[PDB]
Amino acid sequence: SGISLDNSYKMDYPEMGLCIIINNKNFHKSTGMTSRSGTDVDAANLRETFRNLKYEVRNKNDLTREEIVELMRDVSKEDHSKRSSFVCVLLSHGEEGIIAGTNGPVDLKKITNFFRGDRCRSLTGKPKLFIIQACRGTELDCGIEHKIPVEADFLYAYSTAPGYYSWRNSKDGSWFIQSLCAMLKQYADKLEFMHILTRVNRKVATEFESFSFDATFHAKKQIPCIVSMLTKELYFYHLH
């Protein structure tokens, strides 16, 4: 055959893969964490969006820290040999490096470690995408007018910059997930994933600004944060 290139991930396995959505809305009273109004809008939007990309979507609601860890351990022990990729979406409270279970925190590293190249062999060499809508701290943006590494082939699409709050609208859903689904719907058959996420960065940065009766929280902006350890271009489509 003719000259071949291998600059993009093979996305023509029989299955695109799993899309696990963990949607934590209601938290145990003792934690003091508030209910996350708007998050069901996000979860529904993500389900539809990834359905149209031919992912096998599994929605999970209000998981404890123990249930989150058990779920991701179990998913990492499935046979992903016939799947092109893996997607996990986390919708919760959080802080830098941490996602909230309904009864307490889980280290993000604990979750992602299950999918390391040496620990989930049927996903080795395949893109592993973690989409995280959660705070990463409490800063507010005021704006201005023969071997491969075990950490390779991960992409973390964070809703917000390190150290910062992340914004969620109780009616419309989170700024980031709103924007992410819109850009996937418009561009997934057209653009490489990093370019889609760059459009998401621009949409969040330009089209949203907080409104609050509290001056501390009013007129604030957000920029998401793309963290890529990918080794190839990622297109959700393939050529026949």
């Binding site: 996350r36 809508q133 914004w167 969620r168 609208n169 409104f211 929280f217």
Partner: peptide, 4 residues
């Protein structure tokens, strides 16, 4: 608008 609320923070996560």
């Amino acid at each position: 608008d609320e923070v996560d």
